[PDB]
Amino acid sequence: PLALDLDGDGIETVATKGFSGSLFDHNRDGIRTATGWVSADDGLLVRDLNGNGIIDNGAELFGDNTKLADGSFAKHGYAALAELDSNGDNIINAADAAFQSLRVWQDLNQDGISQANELRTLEELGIQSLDLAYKDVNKNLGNGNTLAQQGSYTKTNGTTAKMGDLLLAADNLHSRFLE
Template sequence: MTPKFLTTLLTMSSLLSSSAFAADTKAATTSVLPFTGPNLNDVVLDSQLVVSGSSGALTTLDIYVSCFGTNLRSVPNPISEYSQLFAKLRYLTVSGAYKQVEIQFPATATMNTYGAGAAQNITNNTVVNGDAKVHLDASLKGNLIRINLSEAKTIPVDVLASGTDFTKLSEFAVKSEFLKDISFRQEVATTPSQFMAFNGPVTASSQWYVSENGKTLTMLASFPGENRFCGGYFSPIVLKFDDESLPVVNDTSYFPLFEGKPHKISWPTFKSETYLLTYDANKNGKVDAGSELFGDINNYQDGFKNLAAYDENKDGVIDAKDPIWAHLRLWRDSNQDGKSSAKEIKTLKDMGVESISLKYENTTQDLNNHAKVVGPGEFTYRTKKGDIKKGRVWDIFLKIVP
């Protein structure tokens, strides 16, 4: 294959100081190891490099932001939908000095669709070198943050390479001296909906791309999100027979609500007529995993959507006409130990349940900082006296507790 002449960002200082370079006439190969930020140790390079200096007055930095659910795994500081995020970076200028920039944007941008909506001018949300009077041109459109970095310095590197080496070498260039560092933090608004986020540093998994002329840097930054914001958390549906009050979540357990190492989680109080809706997938007569409950798992928005997937005849209710009906059980963890026993598990027939509506009120309420609930929905049951009554269905979002 004919070697391709490539140009990418690279600083002279990184070329001279890194022992990762070897002048070799062999075909160029580039390997970039996983990284969490700019770091020369991430790069292993075997290539023939010819360096020539140049500079550019303007470079565009595009940051595409997104977020992902953390499934109640232990994340130091997941972002909140009520947060403002701040990206701080230092880049090399033509003068040889580093310029520090901080750009502010709403966390809700991580849930936007690329290109959605009109572009917003967020220039006034940038601060250069800590001077609130100095700004860089910046805009927000959908989930794209575009910053024009003035006086950016670039040094092209001529590389004998082919295939995908250009992309990998571009990653190296960004992670070397052009961008000295980049970090993120959040500030959380004080609202009743605050759940897991707090003011301070946040982490992001990232990927980098550089245009061949070195004028556009692209970063894909994905942040872990808090409960209910980015989806992905496990939450169980409960049926409440006795009254219309909210479920009570004052206990804790080590029930394996999500995969991985068991964590201590907030847990419902079952002293009232409250039952978890379960499906014995492995048919062992127990409830031994969060996957046997109905929650916001498998990419469902919430437990109601999860249950709706089993509405075979699409009539808006789960009842005896749906195949799953015979396999549903109700679990009342009366001793709050997070372990099911035979006497704690009832069939729907035992409890007189005749149908569960899939319609629900899509509102979120806090439960004394121990959990959140979505709902209510409604189910129909028959009492032992033969009276027909309505009960409440709630989707409870639980959290890891110390």
């Protein structure tokens, strides 16, 4: 899923187990792989698709589960976001009508379970545009999380920062889906 470096030092991750994550009790079941998320400094790119103010469905977090205009699945979060360029300039910017509809999720306990205060606008974060151009990196960040591909986004002061499609850690019995 698409992650943004908000403070300007690259994308970074944390992990949860027991409460707020993968259950790992040997008595109940077994030890299981810890659930990974973005730092309390950074965030994920999202869109609320039913207007309930929160992220709770598998299409609402941009990644290899979002659908294209014909209803085919996107191959990665960049292909999922590229659908929202209106004019064919290969950037997502305020002249695209979807720019007003995009949000960033900063989860304040990093459980990846959404509350309305955890969502933010692009304009309040000072964002000018997101780039659709990328390069593959396959970079391990920590606790099983891996950045697959990386590009940029731009802030209204004219400065650039990193974004990319981040593979998030989970146990293979639940895969942390937005049920």
